[PDB]
Design a protein around this ligand. Structure first.
Ligand code: HFK
Ligand code: GAL
Length: 390
């Protein structure tokens, strides 16, 4: 059985908690979703192509401006580290915000710190989410983009959608010590109901690709494991990629194709060569997968998904036995087109494209084959960041 999601239920929860917490009805509501990457993994920081969609799993901030220049936060999200409440003054020229405890508030502090428009007033907010915290569906990008979307109501920015992704990304880098690409923040902002989003991470061109055929489902399976390497080995992959680009005199691996890589094998470590083969291959597969998805060629799409996983398992070596066993189980189920790890790896989630009617059978079979305890979301493509005046 798939874990259910909510929206107005989250707003009502947010709202009740805020009224209890601050003695007044909140003035403002925002939402930003988590994401699944359908294909195009470890390409965003390589100026590659990614094809994410926004989930119905989302973060909701409910708040009001203050006159006293301080920020007061409650989260009801479980899994959030103690305390559930934090207050801090706004940063100034003299005194910047600092990352620390509790860690959940670092995402909000980071976005406030890098917010490009003045004057930013203080505010009171309640934070809720259905995005499982650090389960591999970009809970942190959902919190950053919801925060960003809230600040825009306190003090409108004059900029682009990418500029806002970059701020949220700077918060992730500087306040959470995770040097991510733009994919997660970009999809949280840019998502549309019934669409995946093709992101060119070189040009920052985006295209909404239809994905709401009722005979098709996206099954997210959470391994409910996260090896420490998810955190430590992510920045290592970015450096090895930079090292290969650098060796080949390329601005980025986007500029490099397997032929040029094959010819500069002497110029690069055995592992360097493996990381680049995945990225160069993964960029190709993502363009092929976009072309496939448009035609409604799910069989081809699924094949490209399996190739992405094999590449991530063997060349990028960012899978783990848990994810591999989850992908093995999925590909054994009749009506499954394809399965792969999604996001950073070393745990988190798999994404499976399958005929809707196969989902019940696939969930039973994945669970019985999974040596741990799997969690399931059946995900339609959802809207990106929204605002509701209360
Ligand atoms: O420990 C890690 C390791 C790296 C991945 C990651 C975490 C934690 C950090 C804060 C405490 C819980 C776990 N949280 C997130 N994301 C997040 N999204 C949130 C939305 C609403 C409220 C709180 C939220 O925390 N990501
Ligand atoms: O495709 C791998 C992805 O890993 C995520 O953890 C990261 O936040 C994204 O920016 C992207 O690099």
């Amino acid at each position: 059985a798939l874990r259910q999601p909510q929206v107005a239920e989250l707003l009502a929860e947010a709202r009740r908690a805020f009224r209890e917490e601050f003695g007044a009805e909140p003035e403002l509501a925002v939402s930003a979703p988590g994401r699944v990457n359908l294909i195009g993994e470890h390409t965003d920081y390589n100026q590659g192509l990614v094809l994410p969609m926004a989930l119905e799993l989302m973060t909701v901030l409910v708040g009001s401006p203050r006159k006293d220049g301080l920020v007061s936060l409650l989260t009801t999200s479980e899994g959030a580290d103690e305390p559930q409440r934090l207050q801090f003054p706004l940063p100034t020229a003299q005194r910047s915000l600092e990352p620390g405890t509790p860690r959940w508030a670092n995402y909000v502090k980071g976005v406030i710190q890098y917010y490009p428009a003045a004057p930013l007033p203080g505010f009171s907010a309640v934070v809720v989410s259905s995005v499982p915290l650090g389960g591999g569906l970009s809970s942190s990008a959902s919190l950053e983009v919801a925060t960003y979307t809230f600040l825009q109501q306190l003090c409108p920015d004059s900029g682009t959608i990418a500029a806002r992704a970059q701020v949220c990304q700077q918060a992730e880098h500087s306040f959470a010590g995770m040097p991510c690409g733009i994919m997660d923040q970009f999809i949280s902002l840019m998502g549309q109901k019934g669409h995946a989003l093709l992101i060119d991470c070189r040009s920052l061109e985006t295209s909404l690709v239809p994905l709401s055929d009722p005979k098709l489902a996206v099954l997210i399976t959470n391994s409910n494991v996260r090896h420490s390497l998810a955190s430590s080995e992510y920045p290592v992959r970015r450096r090895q990629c930079e090292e290969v680009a650098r060796a080949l005199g390329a601005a980025s691996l986007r500029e490099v194709q397997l032929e040029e890589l094959e010819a500069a094998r002497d110029l690069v470590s055995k592992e360097g060569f493996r990381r680049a083969r995945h990225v160069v291959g993964e960029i190709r597969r993502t363009a092929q997968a976009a072309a496939a998805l448009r035609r409604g060629d799910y069989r081809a799409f699924g094949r490209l998904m399996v190739e992405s996983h094999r590449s991530l398992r063997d060349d990028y070596e960012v899978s783990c036995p848990e994810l591999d066993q989850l992908v093995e189980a999925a590909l054994a189920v009749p009506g499954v087109y394809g399965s792969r790890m999604t996001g950073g790896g070393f745990g988190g989630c798999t994404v499976t494209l399958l005929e809707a009617s196969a989902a019940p059978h696939a969930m039973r079979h994945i669970q019985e084959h999974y040596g741990g305890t799997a969690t399931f979301y059946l995900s339609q493509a959802a809207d990106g960041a929204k605002v509701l005046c209360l």
